[PDB]
Amino acid sequence: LERFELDKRVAQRVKEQMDTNQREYYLREQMKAIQKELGGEDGLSDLEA
Amino acid sequence: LERFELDKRVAQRVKEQMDTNQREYYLREQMKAIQKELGGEDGLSDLEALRKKIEEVGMPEAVKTKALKELDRLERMQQGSPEATVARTYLDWLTEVPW
Amino acid sequence: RLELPVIPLRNTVILPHTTTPVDVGRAKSKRAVEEAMGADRLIFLVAQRDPEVDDPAPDDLYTWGVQAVVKQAMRLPDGTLQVMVEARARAQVTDYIPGPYLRARGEVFSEIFPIDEAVVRVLVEELKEAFEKYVANHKSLRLDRYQLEAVKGTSDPAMLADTIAYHATWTVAEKQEILELTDLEARLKKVLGLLSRDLERFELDKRVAQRVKEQMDTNQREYYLREQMKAIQKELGGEDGLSDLEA
């Protein structure tokens, strides 16, 4: 009973892992996306300036 | 009539100017919004406090702009690099001196 | 110029011809609502300060308010008294009564008349165009024309300017300022400009959505590229096993 209970525990856990990984991955993706169109994208340039 | 049409066109031009300027800060808002939902919270609003404290104190506008450039230079490595460390120090210096 | 008790709000500036269920959560402000029902069903909603006031104060109310009317006087004794109001039209405010509950000796309906109908109807049509594409483009709101097309007898363009501005979700401080505006089309230009700014945000969303889609397509394509390499390299894997076997 308890072994299958922790099987379900790690089942919800592993689904949360995929949910978390998808969300993390996606979040860093659109911050890359916003970084593509910024004045601060060019503001990082020092010797280029 | 020509003067009034010129005035409305100039007002519209300044309107798109300020709207796109706000669009840049909305992009900044969304980027900091990304930083909070990801873990770390930007060191619990580390640069967020810095940027606001700089630009809650009255600056010349050139100072605000070059401060934003030096701010966005913090996309770099910061482990002894004199390109984020000196940037951190310079940012804090602009943050702390009275105006 | 008459006493109507002012119902405090948190920050919501009630605009004319905008049906609003006002959730009066303060027990110090519920008495204003009860006096508004007991005051010939004549509400004088004057908006508080743009920041949500910790204590509704007479000086926290602006010099302009709206003379609303009780629409649905059902009872909710839950502490957060929900009153469904609709502002008849805006009016200016002269002097106040100390509270809470807040009251003020407000004034008569101070409106701006529909003047120069040609340009005004033209800008209202442009505003309704911007608002209709706002409704049909901004999925973040999806608010129908059931509070704008629902009002037709009072076709005052200030009423529509305050209704369309209400239908969108920019800052309500600008709604307070446009309620204090005396120019009919500067109200219309202000709503149209804020709608254009919102549509600029929306097209920015489309632009960044295109950037993220191309970026994920790029990552996917590189992933397929590497696994080909792995499907092009694994070609001789079996031979390696054979040489690693009897050979």
Please write down the HEC assignment for all residues of B18-80: HHHHHHHHHHHHHHHHHHHHCCCHHHHHHHHHHHHHHHHCCCCHHHHHHHHHHHHCCCCCCCC
Neighbours of chain B (3+ CB pairs under 8 A): A, C
Rounded distance between C-alpha atoms, residue C43 and residue C35, angstroms: 9
Pick from B23, B34, B78 the residue to mutate for testing the A interface (most A CBs within 10 Å): B34
Q: Which residue of A has its CA nearest to B87?
A: A44
Q: Where are the beta strands (DSSP E) in C125-213?
A: none
Query: Is A40's CB within 8 Å of B30's CB?
Result: no
Query: Is B71's CB within 8 Å of A24's CB?
Result: no
Pick from A22, A23, A35, A37 the residue to mutate for testing the C interface (most C CBs within 10 Å): A37
Query: Is A29's CB within 8 Å of C215's CB?
Result: yes
Rounded distance between C-alpha atoms, residue C179 and residue B8, angstroms: 23
Give the method used: cryo-EM
Rounded distance between C-alpha atoms, residue C158 and residue C172, angstroms: 16
**Amino acid present at C78:** D
Neighbours of chain A (3+ CB pairs under 8 A): B, C
For chain C, say whether B20 makes contact (Cβ under 8 Å).
Answer: yes
Q: How far apart are the first and last CA of chain A?
A: 67
CA-CA-CA-CA torsion for C9, C14, C19, C22, nearest 10 degrees?
0
Pick from B20, B31, B64, B78 the residue to mutate for testing the A interface (most A CBs within 10 Å): B31
Rounded distance between C-alpha atoms, residue C204 and residue C113, angstroms: 37
CA C224 to each of CA A24, B86, C219, C220: distance values in angstroms, whole numbers, following the listed order: 22, 42, 9, 6
Please write down the HEC assignment for all residues of A18-32: HHHHHHHHHHHHHHH
CA distance B44 to chain A (A): 18
Within 8 A by CB and 6+ apart from A37, the residues are B27, C207, C208, C211
Rounded distance between C-alpha atoms, residue C246 and residue B70, angstroms: 66
Which helix (H) or strand (E) covers residue A8, if one does? helix A2-35
CB pairs under 8 A between B and C: 13
Query: Is A40's CB within 8 Å of B34's CB?
Result: no
CA distance C206 to chain A (A): 12
CA distance C15 to chain B (A): 25
Rounded distance between C-alpha atoms, residue B75 and residue B72, angstroms: 6
In three-state secondary structure terms, C67 is strand
Residue with tokens 């856990």: A13
In three-state secondary structure terms, C20 is strand
Within 8 A by CB and 6+ apart from A49, the residues are none
CA distance C33 to chain B (A): 38
Q: Which two tokens stand for residue C111?
A: 């409106």
CA distance C190 to chain A (A): 27
**Amino acid present at B23:** R
CB C4 within 8 A of CB C42: yes
In three-state secondary structure terms, C149 is coil
- C80 alpha carbon, distance to own chain's centre: 21
Resolution (A): 3.8
Count helices and strands (H / E) in chain A: 2, 0
Residues of A with CB under 8 A from a CB of B: 24, 27-28, 30-31, 34-35, 37-41, 43-44, 46
Q: Which two tokens stand for residue A40?
A: 């601060």
Q: How far apart are the first and last CA of chain C?
A: 107
Query: Is C200's CB within 8 Å of B23's CB?
Result: yes
CB C58 within 8 A of CB C100: no
